[PDB]
Design a protein around this ligand. Structure first.
Ligand code: NAD
Ligand code: NAD
Ligand code: NAD
Ligand code: NAD
Lengths: 339, 339, 339, 339
């Protein structure tokens, strides 16, 4: 059956999700929208040729009984209250990251979801759906390189907007690695530490440190070293290397474009857009959500608990940024509801 | 505006198309099927949970006024007659390759289609939709390596089934390159020549020469050298290199799997399945066709004329296979209907 | 013994050999030079800090009894007469390829050398000494990919000098591949065919066809397809791929330079000359020559016979250049003197 | 004329240097040896066919006035005294790393050499002479990626012998990076910290932690992250990546062995031996030293000052190894004598 969707927040990512659901993926229809900028919501209806109702707020949209699921794609800070409202309904919930902007708000959502008769929240941590990353995890899990000892990763971005802040290096950028690594390793974190190498001359934003180095430790003792570099200029790139007892695994270079021989060099193109980089993952993640809703089954993607783990770890990281000191992490055991 | 499809031939590729149309792609629905093996048609309905009618034959399916387009996915030798029948209707037509198993058959098709007020046939030459191959063409077309002088290509397959004949090295295998190269180069063929290097010990099929070397010449003078190697053992691989005046372009290695460092080697996996290799292309190809039907606009993919060029070239190659001599190709000028 | 060397021809490769003999290799001193351009000769003595006589011609240099060995590093068309004159002395002779530019010339050299009491000529077929090419051969010879069915090779140069003729595409360039493949495969040729693809707009030399395609067949039925492209612009490159029954072997990309990520690309430098690409091979071959001379023993590297065998195939190709037709080859057995 | 060399310590590396000087490189002769294992010394003369004197000790060797330069290749702990003895002569001195096993020792050497009229000591830090590493440095120095912000490196070794200690991870392994980085960056170290991820199950040696992570900071703020992994199993590998403001540079794939396509994989061999990995660099290093001596000019390779920087940094790392805490480094400004 067709999954009828309401979308809350019709900005860049909201419109991208509307486009997915309407023009790319199978089995869904967007039938309602809302945005605090009402004109943006109307524009989304026009631009995507939707047979949709425009509601003036989330509360109103959420009382539409025809909606099967909502996508929450507003400002991060607005996710918590909207998700909590939606939990008073029967509707399935896809929220973009973050689940909430504080670990307390995340706990609030978890606590409330726990009272329900089924899990209904999926969180937009798309990395887990990327075919390359998944393939590396799968190979790791065969045991072929033994136990993972060290993980080295990079999150490379060409430049940022004038409103990108130091804390966003964590909450908008590193958050992807924060969710990814515990999943990749099937392990839990014990600490995080953010350090600041020399400041790049390319930074244009007051207060923003770039690059930043993140070191995470896990219970089994695997150490993760992530380089975050958001004014790198050259491209957008995600790199991942796992060092094992008996071997190594790494992601191959991204891209399908040709190898060019020209002008005394051999070269391949580098993606400039995070959008194009993860297009597959976004499509896969959403398709899976829709596929679950269609069966009235709980989502199988990243959950509220995953959202909580990320929010705890982000908070620790933002703390670490103040003085570059290691911050401990100790998250509670995973509820059965969430295993 | 859902495009209602009937499928003629519900074998391996028929089912794969149904699956695409039903479960992966957007905007279509399979509402009718037929197969000379009636039990197979019924199973396709059951298997994909279709709301569809099973027809005794193609003629009867084609009388269904609710069908907007047919997919022709029967044995190759049956394509011609079915396509001709379908052209007595107003429906759009997607036929898998070949357009016809003889060039005269292909011409009968083109001649008949030319009598219509608009073009309705797309032929399933999916190479044109593979992202890697397209990306290469695109880069070529920027002029960055100058004019293409030589193309070197490989079509590598690990092993073949007992039904695989010498002529199939052309009709099943090289056919993809035969369609591809004229498109890549925006050119027309003038000759083809097949030569036989030493016979591989891995050949278990009567009459089969393997490997085979195909040399094609074009009007602008580009020489195309394709290695066809169908008992190669190691994997399935499609390679493409364009030699230009001022540089070269080549396809990168296919695959997203990790790089493994282990046991004194660095390695990546090689695909063993052509099916897997071209998933994307099949999806893109079909989604385009569906998208054009949804607008009641002619297909923009490979056409009946392309099918014709393929058939003529394939015939010439089969002729060359007899004595390893060069066979001339003189393709008629493209009718404006097909421009 | 320190081997006292004279060099005839002090252009690009003459200088390079003087450099290696003086500054890198052991057991040699350049004590005399000549070039038809006296200024070039003088420049070599100066630039390499030699204590060397500058002779007005080859004949005078050859009559200096203090010289132990001569290097012939002139224009290829000049090697024949110089080598024949040197055979009138008891000096050891290292000649760059080709041995001669005609079959008749190479045969004269062999006929004269055969009258001597001991073998004294080494020909500069350096490919045989290149560690990478040797490594490939060794792997091939283990049987890991089965029998070699097809060889694909490229010989790419960025540009040529004004004295480079169509005929030199064979005698100066393809000659390397002519020698190499016989050695690689331990097989002999039965035919060669040269074809002319689309003429490059980058050609600046009257009468030169570029690129050229060479097809060589062996007794065992291996087919070799060589691309010769001497106005390629982008760089200098040698490529080698061996297609076997059960796998393939390929020479890797040569390069020491770093991988640069910059400006939406990932790139590595390509060599622009032979002089650095094959420095190891040249060093190895020349050191081996010197080491034999020091012992007054015959060279063990490629001989005048190897040069003659190559010249036969080369002459066949020069014949093929005229009409693009296949020319047969059947070389004589190796004389005892040369075994 | 020939540089006459004495060798003190005729063990594995001493013999290998003798081989370099005798068989591989040009312009030197080993005329004297000494070892505390007087039979070792005797073996070297014999096995390499030296016309050399066996001296009963280093003091006696150094009194031989016909010796131009000495190679100090004894146990590391024995370098300091032998070096200071040799500084009571006028001889040139090549000492393998370390200059000394204590930072106090290295300081004594520095202090004595600075009394002398000219520099005579070179220390065997061969990384600087590796072609790839050198090419990367030079590219970095063009400014093409802007200022270096972070360096990421790996020193990967497959297994270690029984005698390999925790401290040797620094003194024998990381020491190469310790020398390399400040030279690469033209900067000075301000701190080092050694951390221990989970212990690999492959470790068989008491007290050895493996892997180890080393973090170094420099005066300009560059952060260097080195992974040291000596029980890695898969191979010997040196990796290096420089993260700049506007791009990145990294070492290319190493190796000249063939690419093998076989059994559903594409693979290349990995070096298993550091010995083979750095053959070129050792040759280059020693040839330069000899070339300098030959013209009676001071060495231009790594100096005693470099040896002292290494000793200090190694000491700080050994200190850090105790508690995983950061240890500051404050290196005195370079004496004018050492530039
Ligand atoms: N997972 C990913 O990789 C990924 C990437 C991009 C964005 N995101 C998530 O996107 C959400 C959307 O980001 P964006 O880039 O689209 O930003 P945006 O600014 O473009 O859009 C948000 C849109 O938010 C609407 N809005 C704000 N508050 C609202 C509220 N309380 N109720 C309803 N609408 C509200 C804003 O008016 C607007 O139209 C964030 O949580 C962002 O982090 C995730
Ligand atoms: N483009 C590609 O890469 C690609 C790949 C695979 C197949 N194909 C095309 O597939 C067609 C299908 O191949 P396949 O692999 O599915 O083979 P198949 O043997 O599995 O299936 C064909 C199915 O054909 C049915 N059939 C035969 N004649 C029929 C007829 N006259 N009317 C209705 N049904 C008929 C057969 O009974 C069967 O169920 C061919 O043209 C094949 O070349 C193209
Ligand atoms: N084996 C290799 O990889 C390799 C590479 C480059 C060149 N070569 C061989 O180089 C020879 C030299 O080529 P090059 O690149 O140095 O070219 P070049 O043009 O740079 O130099 C040849 C030099 O030849 C001198 N010369 C010409 N005729 C002479 C004669 N009769 N007697 C004495 N000197 C004469 C020319 O004046 C000149 O100084 C050829 O045989 C070339 O094929 C081999
Ligand atoms: N730079 C490199 O990469 C590299 C590599 C290997 C070794 N090294 C340096 O090698 C020195 C030699 O190492 P090795 O592997 O050959 O060790 P080794 O144990 O094999 O050899 C040293 C030889 O030292 C002789 N010897 C010891 N003390 C002596 C003394 N006081 N006077 C004279 N001879 C003495 C030993 O008896 C023996 O004959 C060390 O400093 C080692 O670190 C450097």
């Amino acid at each position: 059956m067709v999954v009828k969707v309401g979308v809350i927040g019709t900005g860049a990512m909201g419109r991208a999700h509307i486009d997915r659901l309407t023009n790319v993926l199978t089995g869904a229809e967007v039938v309602a929208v809302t945005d605090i900028d009402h004109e943006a919501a109307e524009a989304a209806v026009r631009d995507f040729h939707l047979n949709a109702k425009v509601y003036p707020d989330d509360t109103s949209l959420l009382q539409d009984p025809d909606i099967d699921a909502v996508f929450v794609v507003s400002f991060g800070g607005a996710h918590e209250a909207t998700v909590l409202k939606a939990l008073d309904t029967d509707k399935f919930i896809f929220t973009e990251k973050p689940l909430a902007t504080t670990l307390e708000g995340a706990k609030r959502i978890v606590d409330k979801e726990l009272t329900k008769s089924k899990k209904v929240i999926q969180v937009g941590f798309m990395r887990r759906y990327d075919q390359g990353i998944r393939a590396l995890k799968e190979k790791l899990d065969t045991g072929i390189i033994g136990a993972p000892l060290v993980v080295r990763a990079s999150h490379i971005n060409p430049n940022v907007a004038s409103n990108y802040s130091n804390e966003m290096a964590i909450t908008d950028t590193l958050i992807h690695e924060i969710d990814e690594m515990h999943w990749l390793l099937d392990d839990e974190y014990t600490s995080i530490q953010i350090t600041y190498p020399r400041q790049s001359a390319e930074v244009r934003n007051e207060g923003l440190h770039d690059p930043q180095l993140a070191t995470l430790t896990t219970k089994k003792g695997t150490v993760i070293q992530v380089l975050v570099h958001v004014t790198a200029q050259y491209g957008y790139e995600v790199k991942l290397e796992v060092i094992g007892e008996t071997g190594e695994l790494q992601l191959p270079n991204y891209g399908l474009g040709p190898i060019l021989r020209s002008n005394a060099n051999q070269q391949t193109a580098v993606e400039m857009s995070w959008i194009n980089r993860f297009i597959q993952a976004y499509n896969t993640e959403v398709q899976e959500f829709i596929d679950e809703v269609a069966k009235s089954e709980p989502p199988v993607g990243p959950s509220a608990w995953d959202g909580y783990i990320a929010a705890i770890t982000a908070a620790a990281a933002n703390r670490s940024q103040k003085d570059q000191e290691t911050v401990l992490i100790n998250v509670a055991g995973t509820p059965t509801f969430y295993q």
